[PDB]
């Protein structure tokens, strides 16, 4: 097993800009084969042996987002900086 | 006496973008001759008879801001959307 990865339970929600139903991140990361444990609002995720590409939280975020589907991410123009 | 005017105690602070010291609004409005009573977080302000220009909370905001000095108002860029 690779080293474990720690990330906040709502990190995929923030990156995607979507409030996923509760348990979505934990369910999806287990679905792809990782061991997921809870410590407050922080998940400790140990990827499976066949997923050496999962090394940091950003990798985990892609798994949740692609399985939930990118079509649920809304189109929200960010505010204009004072260019 | 003109009709009384109800205004939140922090209204001038919000419009100025400045956190004035405690009691600033009540002190300035009493200086210009108004009768000021406190109802929790809401002021009831009765302007003096020589100030018929004071009819709305915005009129009272101008009194506080001009006497505190507009130079204390900071310079921050607004959050304009993408045009
Ligand atoms: Mg990936
Ligand atoms: Mg005025």
Swiss-Prot record, chains A, B:
Transmembrane residue ranges: none
What does the entry list as the binding residues for Mg(2+)? Answer: 53, 59, 62-63
Q: Where in the cell is it found?
A: Cytoplasm
Q: Which residues form the B5 domain?
A: 1-75
Task: Report further notes.
Answer: Was identified as a high-confidence drug target.
Which protein family is named in the record? Answer: Belongs to the phenylalanyl-tRNA synthetase beta subunit family. Type 1 subfamily.
Q: How does it assemble?
A: Tetramer of two alpha and two beta subunits.
Entry protein name: Phenylalanine--tRNA ligase beta subunit
Q: Which organism is it from?
A: Mycobacterium tuberculosis (strain ATCC 25618 / H37Rv)
Gene for this protein?
pheT
Question: Covered residues of the complete protein?
Answer: 415 to 497 of 831
């Amino acid at each position: 097993s690779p080293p474990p990865i720690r990330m906040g339970v709502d990190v995929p929600d923030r990156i995607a800009g979507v409030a996923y139903p509760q348990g979505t991140t934990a369910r999806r990361l287990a679905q792809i084969g990782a061991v997921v444990t809870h410590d407050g609002d922080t998940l400790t995720v140990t990827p499976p042996s066949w997923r050496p590409d999962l090394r940091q939280p950003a990798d985990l975020v892609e798994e949740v987002l692609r399985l939930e589907g990118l079509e649920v991410i809304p189109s929200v123009l960010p505010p204009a900086p004072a260019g």
